[PDB]
Design brief:
Length: about 260
């Protein structure tokens, strides 16, 4: 009924829904269109932050290092970057948290400037065993989501497994892992997407994405009692409104819940 519930949503809302749910070791729990490529949109900002924590964990980067910038770095949806503009900088950590929890595009591009751009992001994906995810552009053009373009894409299964490697498979130190987990729980942008359709006693942390051409995504983790899962949801619904798109992802949330509770 998991498959057929998602198929009903897909049929009724003229949408495609890609889902993957994996256990802490990346073993598959459930999936739908799980190896179809979808635009990442802002979901790559979670892996970016992980890349930054790996560098902090390694010493090649320092969390409180100040990153100076000017108005040239302000792009669409840069709420923290605009607020910190007068001060002249955000630290590596401030920028990373804003990228995750506000989806701040300027903060994201500020970090890419520092780690070596899209190519460095793709190299990190490969390092942690993800041969699929690829960042090819910075924001905002990376979310162009042109039909059929494989630039800036992932698969549900690939991203879900990267989530698990980051949160459970030892990609980061215990300390950096804990920090990035809490940032996902505290995400400010996902109240109407997956976690809306999960039970309110499940610990959920996630990162949303919105792309042009009807892309709406949410990736992260959930803890249903003593059971940890990594989850990635990418959806394409060109004809839905934005609120309908939020509510589509929430519904996927519910279908996911109906399965786990079985």
């Amino acid at each position: 009924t998991f498959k057929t519930d998602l198929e009903k949503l897909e049929r009724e809302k003229a949408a495609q829904i890609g889902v993957a749910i994996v256990d802490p070791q990346g073993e598959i729990v459930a999936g739908h269109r799980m190896a179809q490529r979808f635009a990442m949109c802002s979901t790559f900002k979670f892996p970016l932050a992980a890349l930054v924590f790996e560098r902090i964990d390694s010493g090649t980067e320092r969390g409180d290092r100040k990153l100076s910038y000017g108005p040239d770095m302000i792009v669409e949806w840069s709420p923290a970057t605009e607020r910190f503009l007068a001060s002249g900088h955000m630290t590596v950590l401030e920028a990373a948290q804003a990228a995750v929890q506000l989806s701040d595009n300027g903060a994201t591009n500020l970090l890419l400037r520092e780690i070596g751009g899209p190519a460095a992001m793709t190299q990190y994906f490969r390092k942690i065993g993800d041969s699929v995810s690829r960042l090819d552009r910075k924001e905002p053009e990376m979310g162009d989501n042109t039909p059929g373009d494989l630039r800036d894409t992932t698969t549900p299964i690939a991203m879900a497994r990267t989530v698990a490697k980051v949160l459970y498979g030892g990609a980061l130190t215990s300390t950096s892992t804990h920090t990035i987990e809490r940032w996902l729980i505290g995400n400010q942008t996902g109240d109407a997407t997956l976690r809306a359709g999960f039970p309110k006693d499940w610990v959920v942390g996630e990162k949303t994405g919105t792309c042009a051409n009807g892309g709406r995504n949410d990736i992260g983790f959930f803890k249903a009692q003593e059971r940890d899962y990594a989850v990635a949801v990418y959806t394409t619904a060109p004809k839905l409104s934005a609120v309908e798109r939020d509510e589509l992802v929430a519904s996927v949330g519910q279908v996911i819940t109906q399965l786990i509770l079985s």
